[PDB]
Design a protein around this ligand. Structure first.
Ligand SMILES: Cn1ncc(C(=O)NCCc2cocn2)n1
Ligand SMILES: [Zn+2]
Length: 140
């Protein structure tokens, strides 16, 4: 589990969105595994605006933050899970690292701010849904 809290937005994995998220919906995209809902309180996270390929992510199944190198956001074929059939996921970045299904929502960050959230995993790989192209998260 986990979310990004930027301005009056909450960014979560679409497959983990709650009824309150769907009832206060701003934007959602199943191909990216992302959903954004509106919040009453202002958040403290800042979004990175960059092309970094090194950063740190939080792994809840280890209670640890790990430094990683990750690929640029791409269209990758991801195997079936309990939330999606095997399909192409867009705007996804891969790294070598531990993950498990409940690690989704952990933040990946670089020197400039939040880069994305854990979305996919298996066999010593972790995949992150990028948010750096969502420029509108920084305003209104
Ligand atoms: C870190 N991690 N390890 C496994 C999973 C997982 O099952 N993701 C669920 C969301 C998803 C994206 O594409 C297909 N399913 N996440
Ligand atoms: Zn960066």
């Amino acid at each position: 589990s986990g979310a990004i809290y930027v301005g009056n937005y909450r960014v979560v994995n679409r497959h983990l969105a709650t009824h309150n998220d769907w009832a206060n919906l701003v934007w959602e995209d199943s191909s990216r595994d992302l959903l954004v809902s509106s919040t009453t309180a202002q958040g403290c996270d800042t979004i990175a605006r960059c092309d970094c390929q090194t950063g740190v992510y939080y792994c809840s199944s280890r209670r640890k933050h790990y430094p990683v190198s990750f690929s640029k956001p791409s269209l990758i074929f991801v195997e079936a899970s309990e939330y999606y059939p095997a399909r192409y996921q867009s705007h996804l970045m891969l790294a070598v690292g531990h993950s498990e299904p409940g690690d989704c929502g952990g933040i990946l960050r670089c020197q400039h701010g939040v880069v994305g959230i854990v979305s996919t995993g298996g066999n010593g790989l972790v995949g992150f849904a990028d948010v750096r192209d969502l420029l509108w998260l920084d305003e209104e």
